[PDB]
Enzyme design. Structure first.
Site, PDB file in Angstrom:
ATOM      1  CG  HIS A 101      -5.554  -5.207   5.045  1.00 33.69           C
ATOM      2  ND1 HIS A 101      -6.612  -5.045   4.142  1.00 33.69           N
ATOM      3  CD2 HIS A 101      -5.076  -3.977   5.330  1.00 33.69           C
ATOM      4  CE1 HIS A 101      -6.689  -3.706   3.802  1.00 33.69           C
ATOM      5  NE2 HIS A 101      -5.739  -3.058   4.520  1.00 33.69           N
ATOM      6  CG  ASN A 174      -7.999  -0.808   0.940  1.00 34.52           C
ATOM      7  OD1 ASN A 174      -7.441  -1.896   1.140  1.00 34.52           O
ATOM      8  ND2 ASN A 174      -7.800   0.255   1.700  1.00 34.52           N
ATOM      9  CG  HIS A 365       5.893  -4.291  -0.755  1.00 32.57           C
ATOM     10  ND1 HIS A 365       5.659  -3.628   0.429  1.00 32.57           N
ATOM     11  CD2 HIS A 365       6.739  -3.532  -1.461  1.00 32.57           C
ATOM     12  CE1 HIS A 365       6.454  -2.456   0.415  1.00 32.57           C
ATOM     13  NE2 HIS A 365       7.111  -2.449  -0.713  1.00 32.57           N
TER      14      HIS A 365
HETATM   15  C1  HDD Z   1       2.849   3.244   5.902  1.00 34.88           C
HETATM   16  C2  HDD Z   1       2.229   2.085   6.195  1.00 34.88           C
HETATM   17  C3  HDD Z   1       1.093   1.652   5.345  1.00 34.88           C
HETATM   18  C4  HDD Z   1       0.116   2.478   4.756  1.00 34.88           C
HETATM   19  C5  HDD Z   1       0.165   4.037   4.685  1.00 34.88           C
HETATM   20  C6  HDD Z   1      -0.716   1.435   4.111  1.00 34.88           C
HETATM   21  N1  HDD Z   1      -0.386   0.162   4.371  1.00 34.88           N
HETATM   22 FE1  HDD Z   1      -1.417  -1.453   3.631  1.00 34.88          FE
HETATM   23  N2  HDD Z   1      -0.259  -2.532   4.798  1.00 34.88           N
HETATM   24  C7  HDD Z   1       0.805  -2.156   5.597  1.00 34.88           C
HETATM   25  C8  HDD Z   1       1.336  -0.861   5.711  1.00 34.88           C
HETATM   26  C9  HDD Z   1       0.646   0.296   5.191  1.00 34.88           C
HETATM   27  C10 HDD Z   1       1.591  -3.362   6.155  1.00 34.88           C
HETATM   28  C11 HDD Z   1       2.104  -3.220   7.624  1.00 34.88           C
HETATM   29  O1  HDD Z   1       2.860  -3.426   5.392  1.00 34.88           O
HETATM   30  C12 HDD Z   1       0.830  -4.600   5.757  1.00 34.88           C
HETATM   31  C13 HDD Z   1       0.378  -5.613   6.840  1.00 34.88           C
HETATM   32  C14 HDD Z   1       1.028  -6.978   6.637  1.00 34.88           C
HETATM   33  C15 HDD Z   1       1.716  -6.913   5.313  1.00 34.88           C
HETATM   34  O2  HDD Z   1       2.307  -7.808   4.747  1.00 34.88           O
HETATM   35  O3  HDD Z   1       1.571  -5.559   4.902  1.00 34.88           O
HETATM   36  C16 HDD Z   1      -0.308  -3.921   4.994  1.00 34.88           C
HETATM   37  C17 HDD Z   1      -1.241  -4.714   4.460  1.00 34.88           C
HETATM   38  C18 HDD Z   1      -2.255  -4.363   3.455  1.00 34.88           C
HETATM   39  C19 HDD Z   1      -3.123  -5.313   2.747  1.00 34.88           C
HETATM   40  C20 HDD Z   1      -3.288  -6.822   2.869  1.00 34.88           C
HETATM   41  C21 HDD Z   1      -2.256  -7.469   1.849  1.00 34.88           C
HETATM   42  C22 HDD Z   1      -2.497  -8.940   2.082  1.00 34.88           C
HETATM   43  O4  HDD Z   1      -3.620  -9.501   1.793  1.00 34.88           O
HETATM   44  O5  HDD Z   1      -1.617  -9.629   2.666  1.00 34.88           O
HETATM   45  C23 HDD Z   1      -3.902  -4.518   1.906  1.00 34.88           C
HETATM   46  C24 HDD Z   1      -4.969  -4.914   0.844  1.00 34.88           C
HETATM   47  C25 HDD Z   1      -3.407  -3.186   2.078  1.00 34.88           C
HETATM   48  N3  HDD Z   1      -2.456  -3.111   3.056  1.00 34.88           N
HETATM   49  C26 HDD Z   1      -3.907  -2.101   1.270  1.00 34.88           C
HETATM   50  C27 HDD Z   1      -3.572  -0.692   1.507  1.00 34.88           C
HETATM   51  C28 HDD Z   1      -4.073   0.452   0.679  1.00 34.88           C
HETATM   52  C29 HDD Z   1      -5.012   0.358  -0.496  1.00 34.88           C
HETATM   53  C30 HDD Z   1      -3.505   1.549   1.348  1.00 34.88           C
HETATM   54  C31 HDD Z   1      -3.616   3.005   0.984  1.00 34.88           C
HETATM   55  C32 HDD Z   1      -3.964   3.308  -0.251  1.00 34.88           C
HETATM   56  C33 HDD Z   1      -2.624   1.033   2.392  1.00 34.88           C
HETATM   57  N4  HDD Z   1      -2.674  -0.329   2.463  1.00 34.88           N
HETATM   58  C34 HDD Z   1      -1.758   1.779   3.254  1.00 34.88           C
END
Ligand code: HDD
Ligand code: HEM
Ligand code: HEM
Lengths: 726, 726, 308, 83
Positions: A101, A174, A365
């Site tokens: 993202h 999402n 988060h």
């Molecule tokens: C186990 C790891 C993991 C999994 C299984 C997911 N994510 Fe995630 N997601 C991340 C680890 C992650 C991350 C590495 O933590 C991010 C990237 C940078 C941040 O700050 O968070 C992230 C970012 C991120 C963002 C952007 C937030 C922003 O605008 O800064 C969105 C909207 C989502 N995720 C949504 C989802 C949804 C709806 C998921 C499943 C239902 C999902 N993610 C699963």
């Protein structure tokens, strides 16, 4: 003074339509749009007008055009601290992008619930319809980097930070109601398979490559969200016209301690709408910032993005009453089974001032919850809880990221945590531990209670052995993809088939194509046969005989899964191209423009050059853009007024403008002699549905055009467009 | 409630003597002490009383004693976001220490000039005696880590940040008037030689090791500062009782553009005073925080550290008038040749609230100057200008370190620099470049001028070829070490000799000792012979015949180089041990405390146990510490009143107290039967200069004691201490 | 040549008693000592004798004594890339110290079991008395910074990295058999309480201050380990003369899947020995590096630390 | 320093010289090279001053800047010839 003497460099601080004025920082464009978070940011907002230029240490600079040298053609001296500070800050401007993202666009706004939800949750921000909660919302794609394009095919993120009086709650969702995978331990596998491949770092912003489809073919749990990505859900017209979902089942906890399962939804009050593929892909070239631009300009025009929060609610006793597991994030809860209950309204009504400081550094988060909410054992959610705190330590430089202004709570925060890089708060507490006597144990723990109480987790029973094992209840992959397929209109099904066909065409190892086609044969044979034909693959007898997966709790469709089966069109905030000529029939243009303004529809006046043209009656028409400069990709409809049609009738760009709009199923209206353009698009004399035409733009011409716009695109034209060379 | 009912957990918010109350954050201890910078920090100070304990996201915590687990003896769950946030913040508390001067102690204060200096500089902070400039000052050692001891033998840093109306000026000096090396390119070599050796990381806080003396023996430019470090300058009694120097020649620039060469000085108004070596080394084990503690408690008592700023001024036409180069930072300017003009006074009157946030994060840099100052071509200064901006990018996490609250200017700062990690300011300027029209080129450059003008470098003429070459004028190494030597009292020379002999006895490679003795022979034969005798080395005939180096411009001494040659004793703020017994003569104790109070001298009442004792008239006397808990090392003088002397006469700890104090040259006073202690320290019946004795505490008894304290130590006792087994 | 003619700058590459030779890097002092981990570090060891002085990019330096200036008394020039690389590297030498146990001293060695423990554990490094596993061990205090003194009163850490054929096993223990607190949630509270207090950052390397004993007085779970720390266990004579413990109950798992509860011990084969308080305190002043020195000099003499 | 995480970026494999490199610089984040030199400073006698400076010459010599003549005052000014 280098500004023009007429003051035309500065945009008016009042709502204006897209293109009318240059865009600006939100606090300068809309200084009277306020909320408690925006006001709380005033301690760090920095102006500029009338101030001297200085170093970061406050020293006034005299010459910001030159380095200090020994002679005016001599070497640069090390003692030039002004040069070194300025180039040092430049040299360290970048921070790591988000792992996923990375590409996103954000805005400030506010949320209010429609009535108190105290019977189902003790969350303070839902306790009172007159309690307004500021929000900051970031929308995003998933795979591409921060400099990738907006109108790619991909899932979109929809992240909302609610600055509540009892803590920050982040709802990090999402735009599809399920995810690709079941357990967070596979998230780096899935993301590495969709991301650019590791040897060469190609392709950017595309899942159309071998490793993604290798993984999909080996992991059939992915097929449901793959269906949604291959449909037109994967290419939204705008962030204002897509749905949002929290995906996981969470819990609401009320003051009596009763838990209710919940899934969260956002309904777009502008309706649902998507592009078509060829238009989306072309738009990534002609305007890779189209969604970022559209969001920002809607807010500047006062077309505020609005969304209604709603909840699907399931009592604790009904946990096991469905054919699928409520904890499985690859499964949706059909709205025919559990309806969405309307909860409150979010309005985004102000742009940031600085994109880096507010958008780039924002941290959302899904572990940031408040009393009145709680988690479940969904094994994807459970791993997410680890990841979002961990990743900020590198992305934002350490453990003080909640001190970066956009992330700060608006409510009080006090604890015993100290130091770390970038520490802003200077604690005066004599104690940095508890229990303590030297500060009478302050700040103190707070028991749980109906309002303003401490967080306590719902006491769910856990019973089992320590295992790395997938629940057998999660081992069903094809019935939800099939429910999705059968819920789409015939044109939406065509578009799905074309999405899979286009993507698998780019997979270079043909065996991967074949294995994907076999998985499609387990979902629906009409789908699998149509994709196989486009790939030149023949289904085997065994594939033709796979028995279809079961219905989902008796359903063979649910129309709420379609973008278009149930009409929800809204024209306000849409845009129409008007193709000018050098002597426009001014009465046509009066009628066109006022009908558009009455319904909040914007117009862009286009020609073969910039400057002005003069209408039949002497009216001077300012030109917004040229045909090639603002292509039909960027508009919802095209209108050609009468006049000297000979000016433009042999212009290749004008003709192609109409061919492109026609291929992409957009409404087109032709007044007077502009009907000569019917031959360019092969329209019959007695005309066809989706083409508005009259002797003039009066009477019902504008109503008919506006009816077509409320239906978004002219789906009945699809069989007519394949012959057309555009 | 955990605090005691009687409120004795909270220190009084009034000045109190050392040990009388627990120490406290400065804004709690002295809330009405204000200055413009302390008031500007109010936006980031956080309290604690009456607030709830929360996560950093503002969620109230109910149970801060337990992790979340499945069962009360079960495994800890990953969904415990409260535990993970608190452990994540803890896990990332530390930042890199400073590469040099890592151990340091800091305070807030203010500076005011004595008169306008506008005839010689346009610096705004020096323009008017009523201009009050907030300062923050950090004192430090050089070699040891942030956790090393305070009373080591070392050079001390003395860094002042002036928060002026025209920018931050940092005067980053040490407590000797020269440095060890000539050119910044050698600084990593020198610093690696003095620091703990690279295989095993030993020794800490000591130059007494082979690699240091290897480099010194091979780089005779070091010998001048080595002489200061080996003298008692290297073991100050307090940061209040040492001098400061900017070392380098800088320039003042007036409104007419005229440049005057300047060296900066800080003169301590509490006078110059140092420990003796045995006492300093032992104090590094009994109280490795002795200087930090003494500075904090001086400020809490109202014994504010005060320093006069002084300028040595040399006209531009006199650049070559001396027999050493003014740009050579291993040469001092004798005050007999260029007097110090006293320009203003700095008072340190408030401690920080939080050591990490304000002291550890503070960033000082000598290239932070303001209009009215400028640099010279001193090649050590020139390289420093690069290092202090560069080192903060890793130490403080990125290029926004000026946004950390203690580092912020209090005057305006505006420019076109953007982003970087943990960016706090949210810029609203439409432009992030100049020249610009879109914000009428704001913020704007400002021409240089007499006041509030832009910075412009003095237009010094540069003529020469691009060379890596030391100026021949820097190639003289012995005449300044010799002027310093000749300026010391006889006992200060003995301590120098002893410093070299101790250090070189710890060098394992004997040839290095021999090479250092050869260098000393180039300075002064007496010195060289005295050091050689202690090492069992005999000077050769050649060494006996080395011609001494020349006088410095006709001087063969300058008494301003001695700590003690000219009396500048101030007793206010000093501390005396009073050794109690279980029936003290109350009339001695009244007279003692009254006379000490009158001179602002503190006392600590010591005994063999804690608690209280009762005097002959029944006065209850609280005990501050035991004889072993608060050794004589920690005080300036010892007084023993009369009473039941039998109680303590055979206590080995009380006898040793007086042996240690005697060995370290401290004044000792004994009343009535306390004179039986004369026998432990071998004093003849007729008494000895430096031991005060009388039938009662008498009042003439106190004048004699306080006279000795104003002379600091009893130097004439040195030949008597070699006997004493202590 | 700056070295003396007689070779006395260079320590003998053989075992020598403390003080007989200057100390040296281990691979120079004892080139014949080896094990599988020391061998694998060879690819990154850099020598020095007979090599030219260069930048980090491999460009030979001609004058390492001067900056580049316009004239020998003129200003330093920004094009001096040799000066800026050397000072940039110096400027960024330090990394954050460990949040706790920042002061510590370490050595290489090896471990071998007396017999196969396969009836109780399938751990490979315990499967065969002929299997030798390299180790790296660090001993430490807890509270003080990396530049604090060795002979303080404090708990000591004793951490062993076993470089096994089936992965790294780290046994991260202390020199007493229990800890101060029950639940990890309280570790930042306990550690803030023992650490230098937050207004003034005093005292270093000492639990003798109000906030530590405030916490203990309010958290009686801490009294067991406090007893240990207040005993002469808190002031060991050497890292060679102290016990080690893993503290927690762990599990051993054999090939049949049976679990046995285990607690880990190290027995010092040099025996148990501590200082007395006045000696330990005065030693923090006279030689704040006494334990680090004693460890290094024992190994240089062949008095190798041995533990069971 | 920020992009690549510290001053040892020349030890990242792609950036490493293939020719010899030796000097007295030590430590920094993610230090790979383990120096065995008893000395971390020069001049030193304890390692007979190695690694050593090398005079400039026709091949394999130390770097020396060309001794360009510099004449002018300390100015922030654009050369008129550039206008
Ligand atoms: C186990 C790891 C993991 C999994 C299984 C997911 N994510 Fe995630 N997601 C991340 C680890 C992650 C991350 C590495 O933590 C991010 C990237 C940078 C941040 O700050 O968070 C992230 C970012 C991120 C963002 C952007 C937030 C922003 O605008 O800064 C969105 C909207 C989502 N995720 C949504 C989802 C949804 C709806 C998921 C499943 C239902 C999902 N993610 C699963
Ligand atoms: C010439 C005599 C010098 C004196 C008196 C001097 C003084 C100081 C002082 C007083 C500080 C501590 C500031 C504080 O309290 O926070 C300091 C830090 C520093 N100095 Fe200088 N110094 C000198 C030479 C140099 C040279 C030549 C260099 C570089 C080549 C240098 C590089 C540094 C670095 C990297 C730090 C740590 C700064 C920080 O991390 O913020 N010093 N020195
Ligand atoms: C059970 C009692 C404990 C013992 C005996 C123990 C032992 C140790 C030892 C010996 C080290 C130093 C390793 C080295 O020499 O490099 C260490 C480091 C560390 N410990 Fe533990 N510890 C214990 C409890 C904890 C707890 C409960 C936590 C947190 C929940 C913790 C967090 C850390 C941290 C953050 C470090 C620094 C590690 C690094 O930076 O590499 N300690 N501890």
């Amino acid at each position: 003074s280098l500004a023009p003497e007429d003051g035309s460099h500065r945009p008016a601080a009042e709502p204006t339509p897209p293109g009318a004025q240059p865009t600006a920082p939100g606090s300068l464009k809309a200084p009277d749009t306020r909320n408690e978070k925006l006001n709380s940011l005033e301690d760090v907002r920095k102006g500029s007008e009338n101030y001297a230029l200085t170093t970061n240490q406050g020293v006034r600079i005299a010459d910001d055009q030159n380095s200090l040298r020994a002679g005016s053609r001599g070497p640069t001296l090390l003692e030039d601290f002004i040069l070194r500070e300025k180039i040092t800050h430049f040299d360290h401007e970048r921070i790591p992008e988000r792992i996923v993202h990375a590409r996103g666009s954000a805005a400030h706004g506010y949320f209010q619930p429609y009535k108190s939800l105290s019977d189902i949750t003790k969350a303070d921000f839902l306790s009172d319809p007159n309690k307004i909660t500021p929000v900051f919302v970031r929308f995003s794609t998933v795979q591409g980097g921060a400099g990738s394009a907006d109108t790619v095919r991909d899932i979109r993120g929809f992240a909302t930070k609610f600055y509540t009086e009892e803590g920050i709650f982040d709802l990090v969702g999402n735009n599809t109601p399920i995810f690709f995978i079941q357990d967070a331990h596979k998230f780096p596998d899935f993301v590495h398979a969709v991301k650019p491949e590791p040897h060469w770092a190609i392709p950017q912003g595309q899942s159309a490559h071998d490793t993604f489809w290798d993984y999909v073919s080996l992991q059939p749990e992915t097929l449901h969200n793959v269906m949604w990505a291959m449909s037109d859900r994967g290419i939204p017209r705008s962030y204002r016209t897509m749905e949002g979902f929290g995906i996981h089942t969470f819990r609401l906890i009320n003051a009596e301690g009763k838990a209710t399962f919940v899934r969260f939804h956002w309904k777009p009050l502008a309706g649902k709408a998507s592009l078509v593929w060829d238009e989306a892909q072309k738009l990534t070239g002609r305007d890779p910032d189209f969604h970022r631009r559209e969001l920002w300009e809607a807010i500047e025009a006062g077309d505020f993005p609005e969304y209604e929060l709603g909840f699907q609610l399931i009592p604790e006793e009904d946990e096991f009453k469905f054919d699928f597991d409520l904890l499985d994030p690859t499964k949706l809860i059909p709205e025919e089974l559990v309806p969405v209950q309307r909860v409150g309204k979010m309005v985004l009504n102000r742009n940031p001032d600085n994109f880096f400081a507010e958008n780039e550094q924002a941290a959302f988060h899904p572990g940031h919850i408040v009393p009145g909410l709680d988690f479940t054992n969904d094994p994807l959610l459970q791993g997410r809880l680890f990841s979002y705190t961990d990743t900020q330590i590198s992305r934002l430089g350490g453990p003080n990221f909640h001190e970066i202004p956009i992330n700060r709570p608006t409510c009080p925060y006090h604890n015993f945590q100290r130091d770390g890089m970038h520490r802003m708060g200077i604690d005066t507490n004599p104690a940095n531990y508890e229990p303590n006597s030297i500060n009478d144990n302050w700040p103190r723990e707070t028991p749980p209670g109906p309002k303003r109480g401490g967080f306590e987790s719902y006491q769910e029973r856990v019973e089992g052995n320590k295992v790395r094992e997938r629940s057998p209840s999660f081992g069903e992959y094809y019935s939800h993809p099939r429910l999705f397929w059968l819920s789409q209109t015939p044109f939406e099904q065509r578009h799905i088939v074309d999405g899979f066909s286009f993507q698998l065409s780019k997979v270079v190892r043909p065996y991967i194509r074949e294995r994907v086609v076999d998985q499609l044969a387990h979902i629906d044979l009409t789908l699998a046969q149509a994709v196989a034909k486009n790939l030149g693959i023949e289904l085997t007898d065994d594939q033709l005989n796979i028995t279809p997966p079961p219905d989902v709790n008796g359903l063979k469709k649910d129309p709420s899964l379609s973008l278009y089966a149930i009409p929800d069109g809204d024209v306000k905030g849409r845009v129409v191209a008007i193709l000018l000529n050098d002597e426009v029939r001014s009465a046509d243009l009066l009628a066109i423009l006022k009908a558009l303004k009455a319904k909040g529809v914007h117009a862009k006046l286009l020609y073969s050059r910039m400057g002005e043209v003069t209408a039949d009656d002497g009216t001077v028409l300012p030109i917004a853009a040229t045909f090639a400069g603002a292509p039909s990709l960027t508009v919802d409809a095209v209108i050609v007024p009468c006049g000297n049609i000979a000016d433009i009738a042999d212009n290749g760009d004008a003709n192609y403008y109409l061919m492109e709009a026609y291929k992409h199923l957009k409404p087109i209206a032709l007044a007077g002699d502009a009907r000569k353009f019917k031959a360019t698009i092969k329209i019959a004399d007695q005309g066809e549905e989706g083409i508005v035409e009259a002797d003039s733009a009066d009477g019902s011409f504008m109503d008919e055009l506006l009816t077509l716009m409320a239906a978004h695109r002219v789906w009945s034209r699809i069989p007519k467009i394949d012959k057309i060379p555009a």
